[PDB]
Nucleic acid binder design. Structure first.
Lengths: 97, 197, 63, 214, 25, 91, 127
RNA sequence: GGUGAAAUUCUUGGAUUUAUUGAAGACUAACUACUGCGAAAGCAUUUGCCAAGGACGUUUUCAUUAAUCAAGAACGAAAGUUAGGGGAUCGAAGAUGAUCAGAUACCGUCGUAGUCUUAACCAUAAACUAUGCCGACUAGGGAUCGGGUGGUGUUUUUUUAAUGACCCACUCGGCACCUUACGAGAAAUCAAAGUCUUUGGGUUCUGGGGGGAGUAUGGUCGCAAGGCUGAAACUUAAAGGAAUUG
RNA sequence: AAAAAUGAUGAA
């Protein structure tokens, strides 16, 4: 039977989109289907923050961040626990938390 | 006769004597009878004009290019061939170009070339279909046709001759240092066999 | 002298596939403001003093 | 077998007068030998500097600067402007979802024969009191904005010397006037030049370099 | 067996059948 | 009436030389014997004399061209490139 | 009042490079990798290996004259992971805690504005 | 370097790593969405030229000119074919290192065709919304894209006095979405898959238990690969759908 | 993200 009203993707109105490649396995997956996460992290770890602020030559440094958009295929997202298999009614929820 | 490319008869005035001078150019494609050709350092960049390599920009397509200034044309003369200008070296007064074979060459920027591509291109795309047309092709050129295979000869006639089967019997790749009478086959071949599998 | 004395100020939890190691947070005795996270073998309490042969490696395998 | 750092001199690096404090840092090459001299190995070097360090202010923390060594005199390397670029953190922090990203790009030559490529970046802005989710631009606004940005950039370059361009890049007047010109088309958030690269250089004309170093 | 492999092996068999029948003809 | 289904002008070659070679020859001989527009007088009167020579029956103007066509794609590309380079040089 | 260098940390999987240079970048001081601090061939990208490499690099930056360092962190990039490996943060912290001064950290991973086909095939690396 | 771990490879002739350049080909990240355009296949850098198109607005024009369509025709992902150019990357085949009982598999290193382009073919995909097209009606809701109307609404250089963006209320058209089914369904589910034993708005195409079989044969198109059309003998009591408990 | 093949016939 049909598992999903939006079969597994987000494509109603066009027909073909473009592939991306999975960051973990390099599998080709349509962009609308790919599981996408924004990894925004401080460039220095939290335990090293004090050490680098003490070692800084600048009294008021900004401690930049790194920005990286990750694209996962279904298998890699499930294996890496980024998304989990959900109950039949819980599958319909689209809110991030 | 013997040439794929057509020739243009171009007549100039003699600068120093009252008379006309007829020159024999290799016609570039798109050149027509009654067309004005301009040759010189200050000629405009138009197909058919003769300009020094230094005075034309990057990527210009030229033909009948002088290797040395004043030798009156040496490169890209066969039908459909051209030279691509790929750079200048103003301090050295040199121009870097690409030849039809793909070789990269550095010529004096005072060497001249004709803007455009030699006419008559596409000639080798049509098969001759028959020995008679190759015969007529070569009777206007020289006596190099037909060609008898060396393995079809006797040993007295050719290094490939003899044997109770037709076969070369030793490597057909021949060193550059081999002497006359030995250089039959593939001379100084860096490699053999079909290119890129 | 390669001996560092560090005092357990917090016990985080159990680690290891079989649960044999314990995550702890320790603060140094020479300076009481530099805290690190270490993996400990045996039974540990708060305020237990550990002997650190090396004193820069952060503990991996957390939970 | 041999320590390689016993044959170094630690040449000092000096910024042009089109900046705040001149002293950039330090560099080292080798002892000048009868075969090879330190000057040839030391010229042409590109030193990457943060404009915050070149200007003594943290508001220039992004938008780094490239300085190209042009000649060596004594123990001082007199550099000149070689390029400008934003930091990766700045670019990635500005590129967010639910807004249109407008990029413009021109190649123009200054009054002196410095042909250079100027880039420019802007993002669509939500109006105050806007309830709509995203604030995208309608692809005709984008073309009009790109046209007016291109004319502004082409007008401020080719009307200036490389030094005057640098001295007007530091206070960010180009992006403010871009905002003034575009404000009747579509509101924008982060208008920046984001990058200046130099494509061809004129003759050395050492007189101009010494005019920038004095 | 997977259907596309049924199709592929059947196609190879049809090639062999065509070859032997062309030999006969 | 239609006299040949596919050989066309290559029906002069009978059954020899191979159908692939005959097809290649058919394409290029149709191109070679076509009549072409004159760029000068506007009539459909340009024919090939010998390879690379194309003459208009009226206005008697002769232009250097391709071996089997009046203009090759390479020559048209070169004409456009030379025009572009000329325009930037003159402006 | 301090002499600056550039640390140019390359933290991939399978390895960690700690590579201090002058400001120009064409003179190198103390390029040390984790693969010559460990002998395991799988621990070459470990934080312990990166910390040992950065300690050696700081030791050679001293007694050569480098006192402060700008930081250029980098991943493999290109069409590959462009996620920094495990050793980048450990090398950073070892540099900061081994007497060197620090300034101007930046991520310089090569990012395509678009790229050649990525390795792995259409169905990806199948494990 | 690479991996789960390695090895095959490269490396004191300096590999990897750093810097400054250059060349080549391919791609068009981030922005990028339950967003847009197209008959579908498909289509994402800028600018210029060329023709086209939907929707909206319209007290413009014609007046049935229309709907669906055997035969017939154009287009038609990828792979594949012919010939020229190109050939960076990745990579069928192949070669190799591993793993393994074996392992010409998965994993690793290379690597041909191919991948790109021009000119011709091929005409197939889970070419999918697995839902033909045209028309009418039947339920609540909030968003969104394009067009239009209104507001004595905000906002920008001068603060109604040279005009976009936003807000509010409508409306036509579109991609969709949420809730519920009065209804439908075997159910999954569905806003059409409803208005169907209270069975008829118009029309095209397809199916008739499972195999044999999209096979054989004939025809036809194609360079070929193959496409389209397409049986019978024989065999068999289930095969299959959607849900329930384990 | 190491390796892990197989299990005779009928049988409220």
């Amino acid at each position: 039977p049909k598992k999903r009203a939006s079969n597994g993707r987000n494509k109603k109105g066009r027909g073909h989109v473009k592939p991306v490649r999975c960051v973990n396995c390099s599998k080709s997956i349509p962009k609308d289907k790919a599981i996408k996460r924004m990894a925004i992290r401080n460039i220095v770890e939290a335990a090293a923050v004090r050490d680098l602020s003490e070692a800084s030559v600048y009294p008021e440094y900004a401690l930049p961040k790194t920005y990286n958009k990750l694209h996962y295929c279904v298998s890699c997202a499930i294996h890496a626990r980024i998304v989990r298999v959900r109950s039949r009614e819980d599958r319909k929820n689209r809110a991030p938390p | 006769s013997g040439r794929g490319a057509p020739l243009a008869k171009v007549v100039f005035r003699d600068p120093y004597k009252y008379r006309l001078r007829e020159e024999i150019f290799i016609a570039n494609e798109g050149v027509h009878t009654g067309q004005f050709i301009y040759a010189g350092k200050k000629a405009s960049l138009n197909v058919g004009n003769v300009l020094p390599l230094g005075s034309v920009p990057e990527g210009t397509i030229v033909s009948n290019v002088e290797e040395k200034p004043g030798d009156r044309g040496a490169l890209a003369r066969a039908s459909g061939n051209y030279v691509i200008i790929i750079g200048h070296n103003p301090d050295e007064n040199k121009t870097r170009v690409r030849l039809p074979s793909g070789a990269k060459k550095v010529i004096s920027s005072d060497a001249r070339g004709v803007i455009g591509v030699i006419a008559g291109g596409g000639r080798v795309d049509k098969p001759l279909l028959k020995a008679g047309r190759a015969f007529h092709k070569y009777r206007l050129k020289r006596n190099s046709w037909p060609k008898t295979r060396g393995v079809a000869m006797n040993p007295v006639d050719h290094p490939h001759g003899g044997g109770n089967h037709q076969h070369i019997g030793k490597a057909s790749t021949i060193s550059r240092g081999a002497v006359s009478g030995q250089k039959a086959g593939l001379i100084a071949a860096r490699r053999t066999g079909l290119l890129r599998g | 002298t390669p001996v560092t004395l560090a005092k357990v100020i917090k016990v985080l939890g159990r680690t290891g596939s079989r649960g044999g190691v314990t995550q702890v947070r320790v603060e140094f005795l020479e300076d009481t403001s530099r805290t690190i996270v270490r993996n400990v073998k045996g039974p540990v309490r708060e305020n237990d003093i550990l002997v650190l042969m090396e004193s820069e490696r952060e503990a991996r395998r957390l939970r | 077998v041999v320590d390689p750092f016993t044959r170094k001199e630690w040449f000092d690096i000096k910024a042009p007068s089109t900046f705040e404090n001149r002293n950039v840092g330090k560099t080292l090459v080798n002892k000048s030998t009868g075969l090879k001299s330190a000057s040839d190995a030391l010229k042409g070097r590109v030193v990457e500097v943060c404009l915050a360090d070149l200007q003594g202010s943290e508001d220039h923390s992004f938008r780094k600067i490239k300085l190209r060594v042009d000649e060596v005199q004594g123990k001082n390397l007199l550099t000149n402007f070689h390029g400008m670029d934003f930091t990766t953190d700045k670019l990635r922090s500005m590129v967010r979802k639910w807004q249109t990203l407008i990029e413009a790009n021109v190649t123009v030559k200054t009054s002196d024969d410095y042909v250079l490529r100027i880039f420019a970046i802007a993002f669509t802005r939500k109006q105050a009191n806007q309830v709509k989710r995203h604030s995208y631009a309608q692809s005709s606004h984008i073309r009009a904005i790109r046209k007016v940005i291109s004319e502004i950039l082409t007008k401020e370059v080719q009307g200036s010397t490389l030094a005057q361009l640098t001295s007007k890049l530091i206070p960010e007047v180009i992006n403010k006037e871009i905002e003034n010109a575009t404000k009747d088309i579509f509101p924008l958030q982060n208008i920046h030049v984001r990058k200046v690269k130099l494509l061809k250089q004129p003759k050395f004309d050492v007189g101009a370099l010494m005019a920038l170093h004095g | 067996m997977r259907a596309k492999w049924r199709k592929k092996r059947t196609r190879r068999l049809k090639r062999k059948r065509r070859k032997v029948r062309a030999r006969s003809k | 009436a239609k006299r040949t289904k596919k050989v066309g002008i290559t029906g002069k070659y009978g059954v020899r030389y191979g159908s692939s070679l005959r097809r290649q020859v058919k394409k290029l001989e149709i191109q070679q014997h076509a009549r072409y527009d004159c760029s000068f007088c506007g009539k459909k009167t340009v024919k090939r004399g010998a390879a690379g020579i194309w003459t208009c029956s009226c206005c008697k103007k002769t232009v250097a061209g391709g071996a089997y066509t009046v203009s090759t794609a390479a020559a048209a590309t070169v004409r456009s490139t030379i025009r572009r380079l000329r325009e930037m040089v003159e402006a | 009042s301090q002499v600056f260098g550039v640390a140019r940390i390359y933290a991939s999987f399978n390895d960690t490079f700690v590579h201090v240079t002058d400001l120009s970048g064409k003179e190198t001081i103390a390029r040390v990798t984790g693969g010559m601090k460990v002998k395991a061939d799988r621990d070459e990208s470990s934080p312990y290996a990166a910390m040992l490499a950065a300690q050696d690099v700081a030791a050679k930056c001293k007694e050569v004259g480098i006192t402060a360092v700008h930081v250029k962190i980098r991943a493999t990039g290109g069409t590959r992971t462009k996620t920094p490996g495990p050793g980048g943060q450990a090398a950073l912290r070892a540099l900061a805690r081994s007497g060197l001064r620090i300034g101007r950290i930046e991520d310089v991973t090569p990012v395509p504005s678009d790229s050649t086909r990525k390795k792995g095939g259409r169905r990806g690396r199948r494990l």
